[PDB]
Ligand SMILES: Cc1cc2nc3c(=O)[nH]c(=O)nc-3n(C[C@H](O)[C@H](O)[C@H](O)COP(=O)(O)OP(=O)(O)OC[C@H]3O[C@@H](n4cnc5c(N)ncnc54)[C@H](O)[C@@H]3O)c2cc1C
Ligand SMILES: Cc1cc2nc3c(=O)[nH]c(=O)nc-3n(C[C@H](O)[C@H](O)[C@H](O)COP(=O)(O)OP(=O)(O)OC[C@H]3O[C@@H](n4cnc5c(N)ncnc54)[C@H](O)[C@@H]3O)c2cc1C
Ligand SMILES: CC(C)=CCC/C(C)=C\CC/C(C)=C/CC/C(C)=C/CC/C(C)=C/CC/C(C)=C/CC/C(C)=C\CC1=C(C)C(=O)c2ccccc2C1=O
Ligand code: SF4
């Protein structure tokens with residue numbers, strides 16, 4: 001059997017976290033926090049890996065004390081255990097500080113079940129969409145980083161090596177990853193299941209294993225605002241786009257078509273199209 | 283346009299593959315119905331009677347239940363959305 | 375594996391959680407099935423929740439909810455406002471013994487029912503959110519023996535099922551009760567906005583301070599001649615402004631029930647109170663209020679099945695006591711099932727005691743009283759069409775000083791009241807409503 | 813305006829009820845009307861009647877509405 005660990009993050013529901021122009025702020029109060037939607041695909045893949053190969057899946061979150069409800073929503077997928085890294089020693093952490101906590105969080109999981117055969121993260125969180133925790137976690141363990149996974153082909157549990165289909169910008173590519181690996185799952189991998197009641201009822205009366213900074217044995221100031229190299233100095237909402245102008249009208253039946261290409265070339269961004277160079281460069 | 287400014291304030295988990303508002307018979311809405319009370323009494327502008335049929339924008343449904351009741355002919359297959367779907371009222 | 379429970383309470387509103395609180399405090403394996411993400415996620419209420427039906431449920435309710443964000447701005451003043459074309463007749467009543475012995479709190483039901491779920495969870499009940507009940511699993515006797523859900527392996531087994539699912543009696547009709555659907559005269563479309571008003575304009579426009587609240591009840595011609603009782607409640611850092619009108623009146627007027635809330639925001643008085651704090655709407659809600667009552671309620675009991683709250687159409691909407699009736703109906707159903715569990719019988723011989731407790735208490739006596747209330751209001755269309763706008767122009771003429779010698783304002787008021795309605799219509803309408811108030 | 817409220821304060825002097833029982837009774841009645849304590853709304857419609865017809869009889873209430881009517885003309 002394999003050992004899967006799914007690092008999930010409790011993220012505010014950013015479909016509802018919207019911009020209020022009159023206060024010039026994010027009105028995110030009252031909006032409940034959910035799983036990161038890139039991580040619901042990671043949890044559904046882990047539940048698929050549990051019913052196909054019997055892999056003991058853990059789920060770990062370094063977050064606030066209100067993030068134990070995200071860890072209970074991960075047990076609704078059918079997972080074995082949830083692990084909470086809850087301490088305000090970990091508050092205000094950046095990616096290097098999160099990964100240092102998550103490396104020592106998964107290292108204590110390794111003292112329970114064995115060496116972790118697969119680490120599933122999401123492609124991005126939505127609050128602070130950096131996406132560097134997954135890449136960062138493959139470097140602490142020295143594992144194979146398969147990022148931006150769109151498909152899973154052969155997950156050979158005997159050869160301890162699986163074939164993913166990583167998305168890049170020039171195109172997808174099949175990659176023979178060598179387990180132990182750290183995957184990083186996109187939205188396009190699968191669609192997460194509607195959870196059954198015996199797992200959802202078990203998810204309600206479940207208490208995730210809470211580990212403080214004394215429980216892990218890490219450095220006390222390598223995890224919070226002190227183990228954070230970067231510092232967020234100011235957060236500010238963007239502007240109100242930019243008022244446009246009806247280039248053409250309802251009269252011009254087509255003469256509006258070249259008036260579009262007339263006014264395209266006044267913009268800087270048409271250099272970036274990679275297919276409008278024969279009308280810009282010439 | 284006007285009320286979808288205010289429906290943007292609400293929180294939804296939309297179930298797009300499972301429309302919970304189905305119309306049982308589109309022909310009752312064309313000739314049998316005179317005033318279309320599903321359109322004029324829907325607090326979320328879900329129903330819009332085009333000449334292409336009835337456009338049921340079920341994604342903005344506030345799950346009140348008016349449409350099922352105000353419809354005189356009973357041809358609204360009205361369900362609640364599934365669990366964890368539909369409106370999710372924060373400070374309701 | 376079978377998911378076995380004692381009682382399954384469908385719905386986690388006021389009647390669902392109050393029924394589950396008494397069963398879980400008395401040691402019953404009671405499960406609550408709620409179709410929302412959290413309890414309170416599908417619940418709409420303007421907010422005035424009365425503390426006496428909850429002090430029967432939880433005798434230490436005001437100590438537990440003081441530290442939390444369940445309750446919101448203790449109601450010490452209850453106003454009734456008669457909106458005119460430009461004026462308002464405020465008829466308030468502020469009481470200062472409600473500051474230390476509270477009568478009611480304003481609530482936001484996603485904040486209240488999420489806290490109320492946490493007390494029901496601490497009582498020992500398993501609250502199962504994100505789960506919609508579709509039908510009932512039945513034994514071969516043909517009675518309700520549990521609950522089937524929208525979940526894949528979802529089949530909860532229970533000795534009794536409490537249908538506390540509110541208005542839209544979809545699940546009540548599956549149990550054999552509610553032989554027909556709701557007609558559009560048993561319900562009222564209630565459209566509500568929660569507006570963010572920043573905690574000190576709430577103190578200024580309501581005349582209060584420091585977690586003391588005021589409730590406005592708005593009557594006038596914003597409701598286009600239909601009997602709509604709007605409201606305007608003081609939350610902590612917010613104002614919940616809404617309006618509710620009957621579906622029979624709304625169907626034959628064809629005017630998109632958020633327009634009544636736009637007529638209520640754009641009144642000259644409400645736009646004066648909240649000047650430019652009207653358009654920072656935080657949320658837009660819509661629900662139904664059961665208003666048929668005694669003539670339209672189902673059989674509230676059956677074989678292993680009870681019905682509470684708005685599902686039994688227990689709402690006194692003219693006094694705005696629906697959560698008052700719901701939290702009590704959960705207490706009466708849970709005390710009925712606690713009689714049913716020591717005897718082991720759950721048929722209509724023992725579960726008829728719930729219908730006996732429902733009329734030995736205030737719930738059905740308030741429904742018999744205002745039984746022919748909205749059919750009385752439907753056959754006038756005067757008490758919200760001329761009567762507020764005439765009482766505003768009369769009291770404006772009474773207070774206007776323009777050199778008119780006070781007999782020619784006592785007769786200009788008589789020339790005001792006996793011009794829009796005859797005296798055979800005024801003296802008739804005071805006691806024609808007297809039959810509605812009993 | 814002086815002829816209208818001519819016999820106004822001699823009317824108010826011969827009652828001592830409109831500021832002695834009448835405000836404190838209209839406050840306890842409207843408090844009982846808004847108090848929710850599980851009382852079935854007929855037993856608050858009669859407790860108000862047991863409030864108003866205890867501090868002054870009904871022959872005093874219906875008299876005083878039009879005895880002041882002579883003061884307001
Ligand atoms: C406005 C703002 C800007 C920020 N900018 C930066 C920045 O530029 N650089 C930076 O390093 N930090 C930044 N942070 C903080 C940063 O988010 C935290 O360090 C956090 O640990 C990383 O989350 P992320 O947004 O980078 O998510 P990602 O790293 O993109 O998330 C990828 C996946 O990693 C896993 N994961 C993420 N967070 C956790 C967690 N706490 N516990 C367990 N698993 C987790 C999940 O599987 C998730 O799907 C910012 C925070 C804010 C509020
Ligand atoms: C605008 C407005 C203002 C109001 N103001 C007041 C007021 O000031 N005072 C007052 O006393 N009353 C007021 N009420 C009335 C009050 O909201 C209700 O009468 C009462 O609270 C309903 O209680 P309930 O237990 O039926 O819960 P409901 O909220 O009606 O519903 C119970 C729960 O059942 C769940 N449910 C429904 N169907 C299913 C299903 N198939 N499976 C699973 N779960 C299901 C729903 O998610 C819901 O949360 C107001 C109502 C409205 C609309
Ligand atoms: C000297 C004295 C006589 C001055 C008169 C002042 C007078 C206006 C009030 C006190 C007089 C007392 C003795 C009258 C006895 C009966 C009373 C209680 C009748 C109630 C009707 C009105 C006037 C109540 C006052 C306004 C305000 C406090 C209401 C709160 C808002 C909500 C909670 C109530 C809703 C509500 C409304 C809006 C009704 O129109 C209605 C009509 C008939 C029955 C019930 C109701 C009702 O419950
Ligand atoms: S009401 Fe019934 S009939 Fe009239 S339109 Fe809506 S659906 Fe068609």
Ligand code: SF4
Pocket residue numbers: 303323324325326327328329342343344345346347348349350660
């Ligand atoms: S439920 Fe309420 S909102 Fe959804 S459609 Fe029927 S009426 Fe419009």
